[PDB]
Amino acid sequence: SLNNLQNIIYNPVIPFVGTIPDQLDPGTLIVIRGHVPSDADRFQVDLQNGSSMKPRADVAFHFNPRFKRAGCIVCNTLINEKWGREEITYDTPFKREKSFEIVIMVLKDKFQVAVNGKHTLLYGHRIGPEKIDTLGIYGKVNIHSIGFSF
Ligand SMILES: OC[C@H]1O[C@@H](O[C@H]2[C@H](O)[C@@H](O)[C@H](O)O[C@@H]2CO)[C@H](O)[C@@H](O)[C@H]1O
Ligand code: NA
Ligand code: NI
C-alpha cells in the first residue's frame, strides 16, 4: 500500500543526491518513478552513508539496472571505495523507453524491491540501515518523483 507515501523531489536533475528525511526502519518504502531513455546503458539508485565524494561515501545498497545485451540488475555494497560481492538478477523488468515505478521496502534483514507492481529482488543488509541517510540517483535515467513512506 502506497498510502502514507509522501513524494518530495519532483523531476530532479540527474545526478541527484539528497538527504533522506527519516530513518529507514522496517516497513519503510522508497518510491522512485521515472523512465529509461532510449540511449541508456545503465543507471543506479544508491542508498548511501553520507554524500562525501572524496573519499566516496559507502553505498549500503547499490541498485544498478544495466541495459546492454539482455539487461540485468546488479546489486552490491561499496565500503571504503571497494565493491563487494555482486548479486545479479537477470530477470530485469526495465526496458529502454519504458516507464517504471521502483518500490524499495526496508525490512529487518533485507531490502525487498518491486518494480511496476511485481516483485523484483531481495538484497540482504550488509550495512546497518540506520547508517543510510542519503539517496543518490546516477546515470542515464529520467526521474519524475522520489517519495518515502515511513
Ligand atoms: O558491482 C557493482 C559495480 O560494478 C562495476 O563493474 C563490474 C562489473 O559489474 C563486473 O561484471 C565486471 O566483471 O567487473 C566490474 C568491476 O569493476 C562498476 O564499475 C560499478 O559502477 C558498480 O556498478
Ligand atoms: Na558506481
Ligand atoms: Ni514522463
Author numbering: 4 to 153
The authors write:
Galectins are a family of proteins with some specificity for β-galactoside binding at their carbohydrate-recognition domain (CRD). Tandem-repeat-type galectins, like Gal-8, contain two distinct CRDs that are covalently connected via a peptide linker. In the present study, we used different conditions to crystallize the Gal-8 N-terminal CRD with its linker, and five structures could be solved. The N-terminal CRD prefers sulfated and sialylated glycans, whereas the C-terminal CRD prefers blood group A/B. In particular, the N-terminal CRD strongly binds to sulfated and sialylated glycans.
Our five structures were solved from crystals grown under two different conditions: (1) 20% (w/v) PEG2000 MME and (2) 0.1 M Tris pH 8.5, 0.01 M NiCl2, 20% (w/v) PEG2000 MME. Structures 4 and 5 were solved from the second condition and cryoprotectants for these two structures were glycerol and ethylglycol, respectively. In structures 4 and 5, the electron density of residues from Ser154 to the C-terminus was not visible, suggesting greater flexibility from this segment. In structures 1–3, the N terminal tail (Gln9 to Ile12) forms a rigid loop, whereas in structures 4 and 5, the N terminal tail (Gln9 to Ile12) forms a small β-strand F0. In structures 4 and 5, Ni2+ formed a complex with Asp25 and His38, His147 from another Gal-8N molecule, along with three water molecules. If the N-terminal tail interacts with the linker, then Gln9 to Ile12 forms a rigid loop and part of the linker (here is from Ser154 to Gln158) is stabilized. In contrast, if the N-terminal tail cannot interact with the linker for some reason (e.g., due to the Ni2+ ion mentioned above), then Gln9 to Ile12 forms a β-strand with the linker having high flexibility. In our P43212 structure, glycerol also could not replace lactose.
